[PDB]
Amino acid sequence: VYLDRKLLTLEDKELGSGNFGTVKKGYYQMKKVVKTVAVKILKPALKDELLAEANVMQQLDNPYIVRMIGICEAESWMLVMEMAELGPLNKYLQQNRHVKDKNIIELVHQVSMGMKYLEESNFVHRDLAARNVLLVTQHYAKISDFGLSKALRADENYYKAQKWPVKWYAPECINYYKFSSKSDVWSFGVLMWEAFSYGQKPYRGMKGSEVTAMLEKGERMGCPAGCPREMYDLMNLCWTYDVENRPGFAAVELRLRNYYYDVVNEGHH
Ligand SMILES: Cc1cccc(Nc2nc(N[C@@H]3CCCC[C@@H]3N)ncc2C(N)=O)c1
């Protein structure tokens, strides 16, 4: 969990940025191999947020979720993770607009498998967006960015909160401050839309309070160009207003798994 600063070699160039500080590429001398890493580097609230985040990732063991190597206290606090070379999903789709439809279904299914696992593990993500999906290859996606994440209490199906990615948030989060796995299902809907719109921001040119107004009227973002109908049906299903009747990730992953098998069969035919 605690890494040795001497074994860590940072690079100058910064790969990305957030409120916390920077993301830089580096190397960590493992037992015999050198391993390529991404490091979150801070610029007291922020400090504690990094320790909590690291404590969450430590518990997570799945092929579709970013792996934490460990943490380090030097110049600043550093959270060290295995590296996803091709970067955040949204940027990638913005710069590769001819990625095939089958490839997108593949990647969002992988996110769904990682989210099904996370549900079973009783953690909520609370920031599930395409910028927080990281690509190892063009056919391998992983979920990261767990700074808003919560381990649910053994006696609760949701976490009660006390600045938010509003456009990814379910009605019950905005209205009642309650975040559950069904809430992440809602954001997955928005994530899919983002993926099929090739990295475009959702609800463009609308303020947070207008989006709320829109959803309450029963309005939803339209089908992206070239997006298969059944994938849009799945999006709308994820956007079930009422938590009770919204599907969980088991249902969502099953549906994505099966649709992907038809599309793979189609290709061969
Ligand atoms: C090429 C490139 C560019 C930017 C970031 C990355 N890698 C990562 N970024 C984030 N977080 C970022 C934070 C800033 C916005 C984008 C991301 N959400 N977390 C984990 C990783 C990781 N394990 O590799 C890679």
Side-chain angles (χ1 to χ4, degrees):
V1 63
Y2 281 101
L3 301 183
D4 179 335
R5 186 55 166 101
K6 91 192 180 165
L7 299 170
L8 188 65
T9 320
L10 294 176
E11 280 182 22
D12 310 51
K13 54 151 205 182
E14 72 175 71
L15 298 166
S17 184
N19 215 62
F20 61 89
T22 62
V23 182
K24 296 183 174 191
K25 183 193 173 94
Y27 313 96
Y28 195 73
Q29 171 59 52
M30 299 295 283
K31 261 273 189 173
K32 162 201 178 140
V33 292
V34 164
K35 195 175 165 80
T36 314
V37 294
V39 183
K40 281 191 188 190
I41 316 176
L42 288 179
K43 198 190 179 184
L46 232 59
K47 281 108 262 273
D48 293 314
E49 271 122 64
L50 200 101
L51 303 187
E53 169 163 30
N55 185 54
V56 172
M57 295 182 75
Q58 173 179 176
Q59 312 183 58
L60 306 181
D61 182 39
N62 186 255
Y64 307 104
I65 287 178
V66 169
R67 162 183 165 204
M68 188 202 73
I69 296 299
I71 40 168
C72 193
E73 186 176 29
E75 288 81 16
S76 22
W77 280 97
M78 284 163 270
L79 174 55
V80 182
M81 305 164 277
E82 75 179 339
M83 166 66 77
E85 293 282 340
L86 269 51
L89 178 65
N90 68 328
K91 293 290 161 147
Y92 186 91
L93 289 173
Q94 286 168 21
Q95 279 139 65
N96 295 274
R97 287 152 159 269
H98 308 315
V99 162
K100 285 308 160 188
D101 186 69
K102 187 176 74 155
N103 204 149
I104 300 164
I105 300 161
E106 188 187 6
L107 295 163
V108 315
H109 178 234
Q110 292 175 340
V111 174
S112 75
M113 297 189 273
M115 286 306 300
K116 183 181 164 175
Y117 165 82
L118 199 64
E119 175 183 77
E120 294 162 344
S121 303
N122 290 118
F123 278 94
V124 297
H125 190 286
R126 294 175 75 246
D127 196 16
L128 182 59
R131 72 195 173 258
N132 300 335
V133 176
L134 273 289
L135 301 168
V136 185
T137 77
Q138 189 185 297
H139 304 265
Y140 194 8
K142 288 188 188 217
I143 302 152
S144 89
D145 297 286
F146 290 85
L148 293 182
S149 299
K150 303 295 168 160
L152 298 185
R153 278 164 50 125
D155 64 346
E156 281 300 327
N157 338 95
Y158 66 86
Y159 158 94
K160 171 73 174 62
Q162 265 150 291
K163 197 149 210 182
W164 281 350
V166 175
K167 291 175 178 180
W168 283 263
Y169 277 177
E172 72 275 2
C173 310
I174 302 296
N175 294 332
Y176 301 106
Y177 322 98
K178 295 175 179 183
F179 299 82
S180 58
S181 270
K182 304 287 187 89
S183 319
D184 286 323
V185 175
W186 184 283
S187 321
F188 185 70
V190 185
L191 187 158
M192 283 180 71
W193 188 92
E194 283 181 291
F196 288 96
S197 301
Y198 286 82
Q200 267 171 21
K201 313 200 170 189
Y203 309 98
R204 79 170 163 215
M206 294 171 76
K207 292 195 164 202
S209 45
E210 295 181 303
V211 172
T212 292
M214 176 184 177
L215 301 167
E216 191 171 305
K217 278 181 261 198
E219 289 168 37
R220 302 295 187 268
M221 293 176 293
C223 195
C227 178
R229 171 184 61 82
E230 22 268 310
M231 291 295 81
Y232 189 59
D233 299 330
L234 189 65
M235 281 174 215
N236 274 288
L237 195 68
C238 289
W239 301 331
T240 305
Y241 185 91
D242 186 51
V243 220
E244 302 305 296
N245 305 309
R246 195 180 308 144
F249 285 107
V252 178
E253 188 287 324
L254 184 68
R255 194 130 159 171
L256 265 161
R257 184 203 307 164
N258 291 341
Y259 188 64
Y260 182 60
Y261 297 157
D262 293 8
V263 169
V264 171
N265 185 39
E266 208 165 69
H268 294 307
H269 276 289

